Design a binder for this molecule. Structure first.
Ligand code: NDP
Ligand code: GHC
Length: 186
């Protein structure tokens, strides 16, 4: 299995969600960024795996689930089987990551992308080892009821360039945003 990664879009006040959806109106090219990053795999005959909590799964429009071209894993201790349209179910982050090492997945999975929500981001960001964060900074405050955990910049370096990630200010629907990639190894 390849690299471990988180991807998120976050407002200035650290918001990632409100009432089961995003705090901001749809940013179509920001969504396309999410799909390009999470779907694109450099390794032949492999796909990337997405790991998400149960509320994040149900926050994706049903017409867009499962996230196409990716293996979709949902984290839940209450569910007894994957949701309709999902591929796998795990009861912990450690279990999910171990699953990628099993024979059914060992030679199929390239990158792993954690796509939230707040509890899984926090646990992933604090788990020793090599991890990158692909963070979209939405440069406004938005009322939110779900927040991104603290990024400890003593361990996560903001990278000064990354191939394929635009460096300049983007804007859609009157909302400016910019892309960032962080990396730790501990
Ligand atoms: N802006 C962005 O980039 C993103 C925004 N969002 C937004 O955030 C909201 C959803 O996030 P959030 O509310 O944090 O919810 P989550 O997606 O984290 O879902 C929480 C549920 O997932 C299960 N769960 C979470 N972590 C684990 C774990 N490690 N092991 C086992 N089960 C786990 C639980 O289910 P159970 O009780 O069944 O055990 C828990 O009740 C929505 O508003 C969504 O739109 C989400 C992702 C990214
Ligand atoms: C899955 C939870 C996350 S992580 C994330 N990271 C960044 N940068 N931006 C976001 O908005 C999200 C979200 S919320 C989200 C993301 C994608 C989608 C979605 O429908 N994606 C489809 C459609 C993409 C498209 O509209 O281009 C896909 O990836 O195939 C829905 C909710």
């Amino acid at each position: 299995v390849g690299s471990l990664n988180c991807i998120v879009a976050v407002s200035q006040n650290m918001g990632i969600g409100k009432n089961g959806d995003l705090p901001w109106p749809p940013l179509r090219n920001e969504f396309r960024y999410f799909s390009r990053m999470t779907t694109t795999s450099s390794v032949e005959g492999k796909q990337n795996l997405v790991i998400m909590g149960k509320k994040t799964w149900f926050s994706i429009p049903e017409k867009s689930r499962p996230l196409k071209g990716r293996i979709n894993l949902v984290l839940s201790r209450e569910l007894k089987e994957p949701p309709q349209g999902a591929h796998f179910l795990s009861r912990s982050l450690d279990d999910a990551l171990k699953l990628t090492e099993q024979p059914e997945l060992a030679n199929k999975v390239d990158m792993v992308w954690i796509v939230g929500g707040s509890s899984v981001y926090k646990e992933a960001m604090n788990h020793p080892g090599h991890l990158k964060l692909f963070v979209t900074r939405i440069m406004q405050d938005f009322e939110s009821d779900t927040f991104f955990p603290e990024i400890d910049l003593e361990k996560y370096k903001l990278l000064p360039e990354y191939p394929g990630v635009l460096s300049d200010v983007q804007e859609e629907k009157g909302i400016k945003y910019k892309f960032e990639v962080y990396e730790k190894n501990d």
